[PDB]
Every structure is written in structure tokens, then in C-alpha cells.
Structure 1
Amino acid sequence: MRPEDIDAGGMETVFPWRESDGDGTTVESEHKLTEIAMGVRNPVMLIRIKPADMHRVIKRKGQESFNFGELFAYTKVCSHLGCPSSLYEQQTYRILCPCHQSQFDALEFAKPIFGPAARALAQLPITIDEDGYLVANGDFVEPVGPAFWERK
């Protein structure tokens, strides 16, 4: 995927893919891609903030450089119970979870603003390589998904 493939106000689900994963033509390649698809913490939402709204973005400590300009990547797994929160409203910049109605402010580092969610969605650092393809700029700085007793 490339940064110009997504317009302002658009959202797209992305998955962690490597060169060695292959195109799925080979039997071992299919199993590797199947594992990517069924990974419960794999899906990530890529949103492109409208440039006129970039002044309203509030950065989280330790995540000020996690965005490639106006492209932001947040985990698709809701922090409450693990449902995919993929109801992205482009104008209000709200991420709504269809399971228990949790709402996250995409401008304020996906901080929850409604529902039973109390923790913000993890942000994935992103960048581009020499060929211009969007790649991850590291790993999540916090665990992804529902919380547990041993978390943080």
C-alpha cells in the first residue's frame, strides 16, 4: 500500500505482511497468510486526517512521532472486550465499537469518550521505505486488545 492510495477522510484496514509471507500460491505461503488473517491482534485502522483538521490533533506522550504526517494508525481491536471497533466517522473523527457502543476520539490519540471503554487504542508507528510503501516504524509501545490482571 502507498500513502496516496487513501484520501483524506478515508479509513482502511491493514495487516502485518512480510516479504517471506508470499502471495499464497504455495501451500506454506497460504498457511502463513492464514495466520495473518486470523491473528486476533493483527488488524490496524489507517486513517488520513483532513489537513485542515491537523491543528486539532493532540499527541500522546511517547507517541508524538507515530504518525506519518496526516496518516494515523490505530489498532482495530477495541480495548474494552476485543471487538473490532471499525465504525470510523470521518467528520466527527470518532471510532465507534459496534459491540458495546464505545467511542474513541481519533484526534486525541484514540482516547475513549463514551461507552464502557476506559483505555485508549494502541497507536502503531508508521513510515515509508525507499520504494514509498507504508511500513511499520516499530512495534506497539503497549499491549493490544482487552486488558487483564497482569497488564501494565
Structure 2
Amino acid sequence: TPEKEPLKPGDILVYAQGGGEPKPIRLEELKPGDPFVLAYPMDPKTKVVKSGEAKNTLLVARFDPEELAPEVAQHAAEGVVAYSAVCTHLGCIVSQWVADEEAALCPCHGGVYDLRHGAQVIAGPPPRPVPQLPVRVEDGVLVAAGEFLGPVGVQA
């Protein structure tokens, strides 16, 4: 089905949506230092939101551009970084924010991923970082700029 199609580069990132038309994530809507948003890729032609495949679940956050690791910075757009939100431990959605670390927290077993340093695991049992998705801005809007730089989710 179109809703279960994988993320492709050029997909528009949209805020996680309940019913109705989706909202593209604009750069100007993300304030540096604010908690991440959960996001999905939307086919730029068909405008189908690929929210039916859980491997397309994203977290998106704006950091101070001079706080990002050089390796993280090269895939960021104006301090904006995106990562897979599928926990690498047992596949829970990494849905919570740790304010003092500016890290992503998994509620299931306390996995914490250090986002400014490539989502390095700094707590709990994830065996590996969630992978980063390359982002770019086009006409004010966040767009997927590449494939995930890594396998998504629980890897057998």
C-alpha cells in the first residue's frame, strides 16, 4: 500500500498526524533547543504520508549549530538533525526527551541516545545508535536529503 512505502530521499517531512491533511515541517517552526518532534516522510508527488511503515518514524530536533559533532553537522540543515525513532534494542518508539542531556529517551527500557553526538547510547540497553537521516531545506521546508545512514530498528 502507498502508506507503507519506505522513506525515499526528497520526501517532505511532516509532523506526526492523526486524521486529516498533514503539516510540512518548516525550518522556521523549529526553535533551537526545543524538544524533538515525531515526524514521517511524505511522497512529494502523491502527498501520501508513509506513516503505515513504522521504519519511517522520525525524530527531528534543532540544535545550536556549533554544538553538533562535525559528523552529525554534515547531515544537518541549519542545526536541524533527524534520526530514526525506532529503538534499536527492542523496537519501541523513542518518544521522550531528556531536557538536561538534549537526548532522546526510550520509555520501554531507558535507552538514551545522545543526539548532538550521532545518537550515541549513553544509557540503557540499545546495542547501537539509531541512524541519522540526512536533511535539507527546500523552500523553507525540511526534506529528506539521503537514505538512513544505517539499518533501522532491531537488526537481526
Please indicate, yes or no, whether the TM-score normalized by the shorter chain is above 0.5. Answer: yes
Q: Is the 8 A contact 1:46 1:74 kept in 2?
A: yes
The yes-or-no answer on 1:12 pairing with 2:37 is yes
1:28-67 correspondence runs (5 A): 32-33=48-49, 36-49=50-63, 51=64, 54-60=65-71, 64-67=73-76
Aligned length: 131
* 3-state SS, counterpart of residue 73 of structure 1: strand
Q: Is the 8 A contact 1:45 1:75 kept in 2?
A: yes
Determine the C-alpha separation between the residues in 1 that align with 2:54 and 2:117: 25
Determine the C-alpha separation between the residues in 2 that align with 1:15 and 1:87: 17
Q: What is the deviation of 1:107?
A: 1.7
1:1-150 correspondence runs (5 A): 1-10=25-34, 11-22=36-47, 32-33=48-49, 36-49=50-63, 51=64, 54-60=65-71, 64-129=73-138, 131-148=139-156
Give the TM-score of the pair, scaled to structure 2.
0.76
Give the TM-score of the pair, scaled to structure 1.
0.78
* 3-state SS, counterpart of residue 132 of structure 2: coil
Q: What is the deviation of 1:64?
A: 4.8
Q: What is the deviation of 1:132?
A: 2.2
**Structure 1: which 4+ aligned runs deviate by more than 3 Å?**
none
Q: Specify whether residues 93 and 125 from structure 1 end up closer, same or farther in structure 2 by C-alpha distance, changes over 3 A only.
A: same
Q: Is the 8 A contact 2:73 2:79 kept in 1?
A: no
Structure with higher RCO (Cα < 8 A, 6+ apart): 2
Q: Specify whether residues 70 and 111 from structure 1 end up closer, same or farther in structure 2 by C-alpha distance, changes over 3 A only.
A: same
Rg bigger for which structure? 1
Q: Is the 8 A contact 1:14 1:46 kept in 2?
A: yes
Determine the C-alpha separation between the residues in 1 that align with 2:106 and 2:150: 20
Identity score, percent = 30
Kindly provide the amino acid, as one letter, of the partner of residue 21 in structure 1: T
Q: Is the 8 A contact 2:136 2:142 kept in 1?
A: yes
* Unaligned ranges ≥5, structure 2: 1-24
Q: What is the deviation of 1:109?
A: 0.6
Question: Going by fraction, where is strand more abundant, 1 or 2?
Answer: 2
1:90-146 per-residue CA deviation (whole Å, 9 max, x = no partner) reads 3321211001111111121101011111201100000012x2211011111211101
Considering only aligned residues, what root-mean-square deviation do their CA atoms show, in Å?
1.7
Determine the C-alpha separation between the residues in 1 that align with 2:127 and 2:70: 18
Q: Is the 8 A contact 1:77 1:83 kept in 2?
A: yes
Q: Is the 8 A contact 1:59 1:109 kept in 2?
A: no
Determine the C-alpha separation between the residues in 1 that align with 2:70 and 2:125: 23
